[PDB]
Design a protein around this ligand. Structure first.
Ligand code: UTP
Lengths: 30, 124, 161, 140, 254, 65, 123
């Protein structure tokens, strides 16, 4: 609670990984 | 240090896979421990990943070559050992550069698979 | 992830007669006598079948009303339209009678009275009653009495004919 | 070649202790082997054996947590190597304090280190732990 | 020379390996060419158990609303060299994992395959010596043990392999709802126009006494089990006769 | 009859009956039928070191429970 | 004659055991028949009972050597072949002398096993 008071290249890999995982999940659904 | 640790881990994985390959050929891949199946899958991806299209063999490969910076080589392999890419298809690692290229190829393969699934489903 | 049901592979189905339908005069009962997932008779046209349920003896002929009978260790008789009698002995199970003219008698064990013998049961009954005397507790006595009831039914079944 | 029993529990830890990069001083090596021999490392995971050894040699948990009652037997007294080489570890002069130090080191190590190590889930923490253990192989 | 004889010794071992493994095909070939008998005498057994339990329900609503143990009973072989069936049913089990899902598997392979993966969803499994014919008593034992894992179980499932043909062994399922839920559905199928095909069957049971219904439920449940194991043995033998040929086309290229 | 009061289930009752019916069969034919009246099945849970633990919530031997 | 017959039986059993070992690796110990496993169990004891600590290799082994008389060896193997010691643990025949030493080692093995059971029981 007291923490609340006061308080990019790797992102691209994460973004691509999420998209691929989403596509692999979507194909499973239908 | 990160480069050294990653390299040794890769060697250990490949070394174990070679020993397991003896059993696989004779009996079959399905006669193994479930733990060893995970190692086999990771090792096979490593073997495929080690391949690289060279810019001098654009004729024999039919594909544009790649130049992989050492920092991307270390990061890509280190993540693969951790298992964060287990969901990725095995063939996505074949004839590519860094991890980013692997993901892009996986995306295209997923799109093609989704198209095929849609065509099959629409056939109903 | 789904999985097909095992009955879809078992495409054979039961035919139930809609209640709001005309009646038919049937001279044959389609009997299905089964033991441990193995039919000794399959959709066999017979004249009649006699079965011993808990309440008593039932004589099932074609057109018998829909009913479910819990069998007891006892003989079972099948008489064909030709005039031939075949006698089995069952240790238990269920008998489903359908008004469409079918009777599916599923039993845990169904052995011809042919294969059975009386002489052995006579000494078995003597020793089983002897062991009932040595039965440790109430549970053991009940189990032994289960043995004694079946044996006497077998002995009585054979002595009948 | 042919089930967690004592020979199988200690055998793996002995193998892990055999990984080295530089020669080890006799006192450090003999003590570590004795600890694994008498089951002091049974509760320690195989992956953490080298880290356990590093703390035993280059650190002293008992002094860190103020629970050290031994008079002379400490791993920082390098002169004990020749006393050990003379009387043997399984002698009344050295055996009594040797067991006490190992018992304290094991209890402190399990309580304060292994518990936290088994509770790490963050990727940053996991990677940091991996570097530590690999470094411990090349240190002791 | 030793180097030359090293290969000779290595080839000496293989000749025995092919020979022993050939014998496994010879033996199993009998067990398949003998238990082949059930391909004909099957399917005319569970005629009436369909109405009792055949319910093509969705695969999400069934497991999402689990307020009681969903104890499972998968069917697996004791001997290896069986193919992936002893871990194909393991993949299906994973796809339907849940908090309630407990497992009580059949066979040594399942006693150890669902052990490692789920040290929580496991109370025990059964080893059946494949010596006598698969009989009702074995199925009764499976049901009795299943009830005493969690008597208050929402459902008891069985995953078994169906031997469609010599080369086809599909994965099939028998879902058995506990007494309370089954009688509730039987009540609805009787009174309501819904579940027409079950209307006559349901009302013919409500007439009788309860104990008969309870025995009816247990009896048909046993038959389904005795149809799962008898079908697993056929699939087993038919997968240790398609995999062994897959091991005699490797020990002959080595 | 009296076995229900003791908690014995109907399935166990069937096992006893089939156990005793096969007993009366002729010695010549007993072999075929005795292959359906032998409880060769036993239970065990992964113990954890690599062994097993016999968890038998059901009495196996049907003749003598 | 007893010496000749015992030796030949040992050799035949060892030869048969090696043949079974090929089966045991392909099928597994479970598949072996009742007779075969008895041969396996007896043969393994023979293999280990042939071992013997020498009086000159005490430094190598760390145990005192044994000098087995000719008659003791023949009798010990003869009983083993016919199953007189089928219930003795297998390891009791490892690095020992005559049959008497086997029994003493088995007794020591039993005592230590009991102590371990007692320690486990207290836990
Ligand atoms: O007090 C009662 C009343 C009825 N019942 C039971 O309810 C059922 C009603 O059965 P039915 O009414 O459908 O037919 P039924 O009398 O001809 O039955 P059977 O003797 O031929 O089997 C029968 O199975 C009867 O034994 C009891 O057990 N107790």
């Amino acid at each position: 609670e007291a923490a609340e008071r006061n308080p990019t290249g790797d992102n691209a890999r994460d973004r691509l990984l999420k998209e691929v995982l989403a596509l692999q999940a979507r194909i499973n659904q239908r | 240090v990160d480069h050294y640790n990653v390299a040794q881990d890769v060697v250990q994985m490949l070394t174990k896979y070679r020993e397991l390959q003896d059993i696989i050929a004779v009996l079959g891949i399905d006669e193994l421990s479930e733990e060893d199946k995970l190692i086999v899958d990771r090792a096979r991806k490593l073997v495929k990943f080690l391949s690289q299209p060279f810019q001098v063999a654009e004729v024999f490969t039919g594909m544009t070559g790649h130049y992989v910076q050492l920092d991307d080589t270390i990061d890509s392999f280190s993540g693969l050992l951790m298992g964060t890419y287990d969901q990725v298809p095995e063939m996505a690692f074949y004839m590519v550069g860094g991890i980013n290229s692997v993901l892009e190829k996986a995306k295209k393969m997923a799109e093609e698979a989704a198209e095929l699934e849609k065509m099959r489903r629409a056939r109903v | 992830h789904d999985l097909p049901e095992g009955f879809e592979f078992m495409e054979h189905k039961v035919v139930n007669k809609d209640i709001h339908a005309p009646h038919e005069n049937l001279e044959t009962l389609r009997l299905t006598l089964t033991r441990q997932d193995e039919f000794l008779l399959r959709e066999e046209p017979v004249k009649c079948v006699t079965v011993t349920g808990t309440n008593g003896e039932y004589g099932i002929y074609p057109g018998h009303a829909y009913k479910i009978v819990q069998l007891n260790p006892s003989p079972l008789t099948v008489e064909y339209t030709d005039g031939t009698t075949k006698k089995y002995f069952v240790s238990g199970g269920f008998a489903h009678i359908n008004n469409e003219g079918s009777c599916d008698v599923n039993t845990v064990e169904c052995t011809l009275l042919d294969d059975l013998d009386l002489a052995i049961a006579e000494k078995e009954l003597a020793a089983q009653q002897a062991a009932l005397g040595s039965a440790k507790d109430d549970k053991a006595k009940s189990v032994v009495e289960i043995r004694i009831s079946v044996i006497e039914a077998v002995i009585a079944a054979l002595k009948h004919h | 070649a042919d089930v967690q029993t004592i020979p199988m529990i200690r055998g793996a830890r002995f193998v892990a202790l055999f990984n080295q990069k530089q020669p080890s001083y006799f006192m450090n090596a003999i003590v570590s082997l004795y600890a694994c021999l008498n089951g002091y490392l049974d509760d320690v995971k195989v992956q953490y054996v080298k880290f356990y050894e590093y703390l035993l040699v280059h650190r002293d948990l008992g002094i860190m947590y103020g629970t050290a009652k031994n008079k002379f037997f400490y791993m920082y007294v390098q002169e004990l190597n020749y006393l050990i080489r003379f009387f043997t570890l399984n002698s009344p002069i050295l055996h009594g304090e040797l067991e006490e130090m190992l018992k304290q080191h094991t209890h402190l190590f399990l309580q304060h280190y292994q518990s936290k190590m088994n509770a790490i889930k963050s990727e940053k923490d996991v990677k940091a732990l991996k570097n530590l253990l690999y470094s411990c192989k090349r240190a002791v | 020379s030793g180097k030359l004889r090293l290969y000779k010794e290595k080839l000496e071992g293989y000749n025995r390996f092919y020979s022993i493994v050939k014998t496994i095909k010879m033996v199993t070939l009998a067990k398949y060419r003998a238990a082949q008998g059930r391909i004909r005498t099957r399917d005319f057994s569970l005629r009436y158990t369909e109405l009792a339990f055949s319910k093509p329900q969705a695969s999400r609503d069934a497991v999402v609303a689990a307020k009681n143990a969903l104890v499972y009973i998968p069917i697996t072989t004791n001997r290896g060299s069986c193919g992936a069936l002893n871990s194909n049913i393991v993949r299906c089990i994973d796809s339907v994992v849940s908090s309630k899902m407990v497992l009580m598997p059949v066979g040594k392979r399942g006693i150890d395959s669902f052990s490692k993966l789920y040290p929580d969803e496991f109370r025990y499994g059964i080893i059946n010596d494949m010596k006598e014919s698969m009989h009702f008593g074995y199925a009764t034992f499976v049901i009795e043990n299943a009830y005493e894992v969690s008597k208050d179980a929402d459902r008891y499932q069985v995953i078994f392999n169906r031997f469609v043909s010599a080369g086809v062994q599909r994965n099939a399922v028998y879902n058995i709802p506990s007494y309370e839920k089954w009688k509730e559905d039987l009540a609805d199928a009787a009174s309501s126009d819904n579940q027409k095909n079950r209307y006559l069957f349901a009302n013919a049971l409500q007439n009788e006494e309860e104990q008969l219904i309870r025995d009816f439920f247990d009896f048909h449940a046993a038959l389904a089990v005795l149809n799962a194991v008898g079908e697993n043995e056929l699939s087993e033998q038919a997968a240790r006769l398609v995999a062994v040929e897959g091991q005699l086309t490797n020990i002959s290229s080595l | 009859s009296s076995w229900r009061d003791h908690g014995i289930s109907y399935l166990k009752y069937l096992n006893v009956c089939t156990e005793t019916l096969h007993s009366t069969v002729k010695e010549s034919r007993r072999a075929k039928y005795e292959r359906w009246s032998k409880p060769c099945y036993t239970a065990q849970r992964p113990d954890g070191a690599g062994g097993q633990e016999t968890i038998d919530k059901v009495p196996i031997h049907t003749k003598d429970y």
